[PDB]
């Protein structure tokens, strides 16, 4: 489904995203905002390495989830890419946490550097009371 700004903020906080590995809820919101406009069904193909980004955090099926047709698939989240397109974002969140587990952090998503880094991300959570 398509979350409302503050609704997602409350949900992410509920799922332990606030401060996870130093990443503030504000930063996670800004990420979801530009990656999928808060849409759990958002999917994007990559006519390069032939992979696909799934869910609110646009997690790629090449190294994180298994869609069943991507070269060099590792599926570190040990999840089916379809599980990252449900109204309940528990699985997508856990796989997102897996992604930032690595040294690159949230900078793994180029959109963060371009749309969130050194920006007033507080606004994404402002007025939500989180």
């Amino acid at each position, epitope marked *: 489904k398509v979350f409302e700004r503050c609704e997602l903020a409350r949900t992410l906080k*509920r*799922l*332990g995203m606030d401060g*996870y590995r130093g990443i503030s809820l504000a930063n996670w919101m800004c990420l979801a905002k530009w990656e999928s406009g808060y849409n759990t069904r958002a999917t994007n193909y990559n006519a390069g390495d032939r992979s696909t980004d799934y869910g609110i955090f646009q997690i790629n099926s090449r190294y994180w989830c298994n869609d069943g047709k991507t070269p060099g698939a590792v599926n*570190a*989240c*040990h*999840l089916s890419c379809s*599980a990252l397109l449900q109204d*309940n974002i*528990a*699985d997508a*969140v*856990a*796989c997102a*946490k*897996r992604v930032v*587990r690595d040294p690159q952090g949230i900078r793994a998503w180029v959109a963060w550097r371009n749309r969130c880094q050194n920006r007033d991300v507080r606004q994404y959570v402002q007025g939500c009371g989180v």
Partner: nanobody
Amino acid sequence: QVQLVESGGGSVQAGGSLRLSCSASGYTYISGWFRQAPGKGLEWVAAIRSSDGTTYYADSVKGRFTISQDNAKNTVYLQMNSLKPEDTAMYYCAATEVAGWPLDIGIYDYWGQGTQVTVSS
């Protein structure tokens, strides 16, 4: 972060039963139970994915122990039925935040204090 508090350990006769509890102070994604004999290593026993309720068991305990979760109490349990002397060990519950293979100890970042389970012949 997240604290895990265990309880329910005990000393029983062979064939006995116990119910271990692992209460969390915050959100947990995957929860699991591990056992350890004195001076030996940690061994995976069981796990459950809180999102879909999928459970996983070690061959040695399948059919005898049941892992469950009461979301309203944010607590995970290990119901140990038909205990055997070989089950004697200190049991630890653990939780993960990241997604991964429930059988991989590497993804568990939070651990309970442990509780002793002793089964006599």
